[PDB]
Structures are given as structure tokens and as C-alpha cells.
Design a binder for this molecule. Sequence first.
Ligand SMILES: Nc1ncnc2c1ncn2[C@@H]1O[C@H](COP(=O)(O)OP(=O)(O)O)[C@@H](O)[C@H]1O
Ligand SMILES: [Mn+2]
Length: 426
Amino acid sequence: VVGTGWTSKGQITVLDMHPGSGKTHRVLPELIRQCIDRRLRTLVLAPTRVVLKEMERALNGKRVRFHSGAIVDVMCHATYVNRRLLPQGRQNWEVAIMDEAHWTDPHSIAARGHLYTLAKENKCALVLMTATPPGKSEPFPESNGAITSEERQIPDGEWRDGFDWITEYEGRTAWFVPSIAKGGAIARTLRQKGKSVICLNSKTFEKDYSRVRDEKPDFVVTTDISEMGANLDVSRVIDGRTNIKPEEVDGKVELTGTRRVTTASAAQRRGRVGRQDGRTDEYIYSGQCDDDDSGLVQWKEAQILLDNITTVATFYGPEQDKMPEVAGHFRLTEEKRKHFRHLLTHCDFTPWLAWHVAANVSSVTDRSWTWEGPEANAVDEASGDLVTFRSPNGAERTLRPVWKDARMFKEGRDIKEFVAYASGRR
Ligand SMILES: Nc1ncnc2c1ncn2[C@@H]1O[C@H](COP(=O)(O)OP(=O)(O)O)[C@@H](O)[C@H]1O
Ligand SMILES: [Mn+2]
């Protein structure tokens, strides 16, 4: 598609080839062959470990280093951002290639934002590879094989009858769901109808991707995690086109209700099928898309990260409209950024929560923030009693944090791990 000079400082090349085009398995190994030939220092950003592992098989290259005397470094989107949180490492590359570059994960937004910023200042060349570049997006893009798309009502939880087309189907299905909890209700119903199911989400995906290929379940019930390069080997997608909606409301992060997926997400979920020439696959969907995701906390988290990996940076191109504050707003001091980093990489904190804690709390060892918040911030077990725990001096605390992020207590995180932190054990 691009001959040469794509590696010239300040060249931003968007590889918006349709899904299954060969971006990951064909195009990428060719771009690395070139970069090694012309002896250019190259960074390749994969979205997840699964994709990273699959690049590691595709690239038996003697000048390639995989992160967890070679001139090509391959790491995850998150690894690149997280290392730049130490003013210490901050190694440089002339060529950056970012795979699955549509991802709205705050680390991905931040990464492509930083890289865009460098290339706009001619410190490097940037390749973004994705079926659905930020900007204009189409819900039914081209595929390697035909897809029959049809709108039908889709169950939003358990069901008994009237959706026989679900169970009567003869091949393997991927069913996208907005949340782990909704996932659990769909899965339980399918199993009661004698179908095999594997669930995939933020929690299970790095571990359980592999089982799909190995076990060939009737159904994969998956969150939006499978939108960044998973090959589920299915002939049908069911897609209610909803997503969970993490949003900062009244100084707290809430996880209630759903939003409609962006057109990019709808495209990517459809994109799990239609990957093979000479077979028709189905995409069953309900309702329409909504590209205005500007309300989500992800933009603010992206700025938190971007503001702390620069020393004026923007998000990539169109996404700049969605940066919630003026660049730099979230920049921490060096000492506080260290605390921030530790909370992210060692305590599993969301960037939102890690920033509030790091910016506001006196010392790295204080835990009293986790019990001194307003009463309305107290965290309940699903059995309705408020969570309690013991500080090291044996004092009984009610978990009641100053900064309340609903993500720390469900959707793939457990109260138990936050209690470990709050009680000073971690
Ligand atoms: N070992 C393999 N791994 C992944 N895709 C493969 C493999 N062998 C063949 N393919 C084909 O590669 C195509 C998708 O390539 P990929 O690089 O993943 O596309 P894109 O990144 O543009 O979505 C499909 O036609 C798929 O069948
Ligand atoms: Mn790809």
C-alpha cells in the first residue's frame, strides 16, 4: 500500500484496510522486514498479550525484542505508556507502528495521542493500523467473505421461548454483551438449553482466549475485549450493540446502565465473522450506534496518563475534541507520579482512582483515605452489610473511600483485593 518514505520523520500513515485485510499477519511483518533492512529503531504496539504472543510467532526476526542487539521493540499499548511514567526509562524510536489503534482503553488513547504528538513535531514516523480509524466510521465495512446482516430482537438477560433462532443454529456463535454480569445471565440460559459456553471479558481474556480454539464451544459470550484482534472462529455474531458506561458523576465513577456502541465498535464486533473467502457468515444485531462517547471517563483517564508521560501534547487528530481539560491539567510532580505509577502497576488501580489518591494524599503509606470518605461512599457486599476490615493496629474500619470508583468493586475486580490494599497488607 505504501512503497517507501512512510518511515520518514513526520509521516503519519493510516492503514484503514477493512477487517481481516492482513494488517496483523501480512502487512506488519513486511513493515518490520523493511525497518530492519534500513536499520531504523522501531516500536510495535500490540493491544493485548494474546496479540503480542501471536506477533511473536509471526516474527522470527533476529532484531526483534518482545517486552513483558535488536532494534525493533514489541510491547503492549499499556506497557509503552506505563514505562514512560518513570522519567527514568523514556527510550526513543524513529518508527512507531500501533496495531488495533481504535481501542478506546485510556492507555491506547494516551499512546496514540503521545505518538501523534511526536510525529506532528517530526520526532518520528507513525503507522496506525485499524479497520476503524478515529473519525468517520461505517457499521457494515467490507470483509474477506460475505456477511448477511439482519436486525432481530436479542435477549437482554435470561429467556425461555420465542428466540428459537438462537439455539436452532447449527454452527458456532460469538455473542457480545455490555458487561460481565449480563454475560453471566446469557451464559446460564444457554447452558440450561444444553449449549456449551465460554465467557470472555477483561478478566478472563488473557487466560481463556486459548480455550475457544481448543474446546470449540457452541457459544462465546464476550464483552468488547474481543474487538481488538481476537479470532473466535465462529460463523455468527449476535450483537445487541450495547456497552457499559463508566462515567464520572458528582465526583464519583459510576457503572450503571448501558450506552449504544460506537459505529467503530459495531464494525469490530461484526468483524469477528466474514474473515474467510468463500463462506457466508451472519451478523445478528439489534438497534443503532452512537459515536458520541465523549461523556465517558476514558477521555479523562487518557488525559491523566498523557499529561504524565510528557514534559503541548494532544490526543490523536479527531479525538482532541474529547480531551476534557487543557493539556497538562493532570500533570503530577515527579514524586507523586511515582506513587501514581505504583498504584497503577502494583495495586491494579484505575487511572482515575490512582490520580486522585496520588495527587491528594500525603504519603504512600496512608490508608485512612479508604475509610474517611463521605458516608454515601461506603461499599456494601451484595448481602447488603457494609464492608469492614482491620487496620494493622486492630481497629475496625468500614470501607468508605474519599474517592469512589465503582470499577474497583465489580466488573472484573473484587472487593477482596481492594481490602488487601486498604488494610495495609498490599
Ligand atoms: N495463522 C493465521 N493467523 C491469523 N490469520 C490468519 C492465519 N492464517 C491465515 N490467516 C488469515 O488472515 C486474514 C486476517 O489477517 P489479519 O492480519 O488478522 O487481518 P486484519 O489485521 O486486517 O484484521 C484472514 O483471512 C485469516 O483467515
Ligand atoms: Mn488486526
